Structure formats: structure tokens, C-alpha cells
């Protein structure tokens, strides 16, 4: 029930990309929202905690976005270039590690459908740089799996869960930060039971196999 | 009129601290919102640009916050400690530099009353670490001075300007991110004239003398 102790910081996480996994997609946006478990040790949509750390970045993917990805995210490779965005590089990896290092350990990334998309994509971008070590101290959980267990104790898409719990659609379904903020709200529904589940299911990020690139 | 060329990225910036300058205050929160000038090359409150980078962090100050600072910010040293916040350290300096390095140069920090508070406080925190080099490539402007010139072409507090331009109070006047987002909105009022002023008045950050600490 505590394979790795209590997770100290939950890092709510979302990335947007150029396409689906089969397409060897590249990140176009990412957001990390770090919340100490203290803020979760304790209807209508709750306010976020006062004390949080937030990082939201756009990324030049180096290839075209699919039309569908651009409709969903409002991003395109040309638009990212017009704003001088840089590719996923060593500096970005160092930035992610430095942000994680502001937080008390153990770190647990939390992402909706993260096992199938966000986590293997992040692993793949790091693997292409030879920098999977940037994330090797972290743990991770997929909140689809979590919310299924909490509601059991229907669709489990993020918007489905949000409207089921709060009776309104999430705002800002087109940025990575908006997805992370909606995920936070759903995780605040039954926060103590969520923390028990996270503690029991936290998985070392080093066991996430990359979507593509060296394993 | 172009002493340093066109500024490429405007980094809207705010820090909260334990007290007033006389008290040798310490940072408790900071937010940087990086916007490429493209997003400003072109009533009611406008939406922020789609493509932005955002960094918001809380910081353990190492000393008590004044009661007034805690009323204003909702932060206290004990609350920051309950959430495991770390002091302003080398890792934070590296994080700030890595975030700046995602942006095209020249970088121009933009902060309201920044010449008197935010800029010398940031310089002082870096000076105490021996890391003023983290910010030495940057430029900076104080948006009080900017908005005075734009309106000339009354109080110039952030809230005064906001309600004067948009007929409503800014939301979230208690977090660093809320101040940065309200500052962004005011800078979007006359964006081209703001950019001309910024280009003409941008000041090397190395000329900001620290609020305290080694000069």
C-alpha cells in the first residue's frame, strides 16, 4: 500500500503534440502544475490551492501538426515559429528538472491517459536527447485509472468526469494549462481517497517505455 | 530610438515578498509570463495571446512575512513551509535562466513599479547567490513609466490603470500570476505604442542596483 512511501508533490501534467502516437508525434505544448499533498489533505468546482507552482511552455515540433491537432489546440507549426519557439532541447530538459527540483520528493506526475500518451511521449522526447535521467527520479500515475477506482468506490475522458462531478463543462479545453487545471479540479473531488490510490499505484517513471526512440 | 534593437520577447513579471524595501525583504512568490512581440504587433478586457510561456513559483523567504504582506498575498512563512517550499537558491536561478533561454533575444522584463521594487529585489536575491549573471543578458522596463507616457500621448497604480481602461477591477489581485495577467491586459490596450516605448527605453538589467547585497 506504500511501495515508495507517501508521494509528497503531485505534478499535474498535460502535453499537446502534432498527432497521434502512430505518427511519431512531437510535443507542441506542455504544462506542469505542482501541488504539495498538504493542499489535498482534507458539488461546485473548487478553487485551486493558493500555494502552487506552474510551468506552461510551447515547443517547436520540427514537423507539421495534423489538421486535427491544430483544430484541437489552436497551435500550428507556423504559428509556433512566428513566436520564435524553440525545439525540445537540452535547455528544456534542464528546465523541467530544475522545476521538479523546487518540489519535495517523492514527485508523482499525474496525467489523464498519461500511460498511453503523455508519459511515453515525454520519455521519447527525453530519449532523443539522451536525457531520460532528467525524469528518472520521478513517479507517475494515470488519472483515468485513478478516477475509475474512486468512482467505483460511463466514459472516463477528462470532460466526461468533469461534467459528471460538477455539472458544467471545463473551461479552456484548448491549452495544456486548461487541461491541467480541469484535472486538478477533478482530483480535488475526493482528495484523500485520491492520495491513498496515488500512494499505492505510483510507478517509477523509468519504467515508462518511450513512444519511440531509444529504450 | 533603438538603442538595443527591437525587443523580441516581453517577459511580464511580478514578485511578492515579505515586506517593504527598508525591511530587506525576501521573495515569497514570482511569476514570469513570456510573450513574443508578434503577439502584440497589431473597450473590454482582451483575451491573452494563445502562444505564451508561463512560470509561477512560491519561495521560502527564511524570515517572517509582515502581517500586511500576508493580508495582501495570502502567503505566510509557515504556510510556505507547510507546502515544502525551498529558499531562493542556485537551482531557482538556473530555472529562471533556463526559462529565459526558451525565449528569443533581446529579452525585456516588464514590471509595474519594477524600478523601485521587483527589479532591485530580483537583483538582490541573485547577488546573495553570486548569480547576477543569470539575468545579465536581459533588458527591463517599468510599466508605470510606460503607461504614463502612453496615456499622456491620476494614479498609475496597476488597479487604477486597469479600471480606467476597462471599467472593471482586475481579478486575482492576491497572486503574482494575477498581477502579471492584469499587467498583460493593460499592455494590450495600445500594443504598438507600448512596443515603440519599450524599444526606446529598454534598460540593461545589469544596471539595476540591488535592493541590498553586494553591488
Author numbering:
A (entry chain A), B (entry chain A): 5 to 46, 55 to 165, 175 to 236
Question: What does the report in the manuscript say about this coordinate set?
Answer:
Reasoning that reduced thermal stability and poor crystal packing may explain the lack of structural information for hTREX1, we screened each hTREX1 chimera for the ability for form protein crystals. We identified conditions for the growth of hTREX1 Chi 2, Chi 3.1, Chi 4.1, and Chi 5.1 crystals and determined three crystal structures (hTREX1 Chi 3.1, Chi 4.1, and Chi 5.1).
Human TREX1 is a 3′-to-5′ exonuclease composed of an N-terminal DNase catalytic domain (amino acids 1–242) and an unstructured C-terminus (amino acids 243–314) implicated in membrane targeting. Loss of TREX1 function results in accumulation of cytosolic DNA, inappropriate activation of cGAS-STING signaling, and severe autoimmunity. The overall structure of hTREX1 adopts the homodimeric conformation previously defined for mTREX1 with enzymatic active sites on opposite outer faces of the dimer.
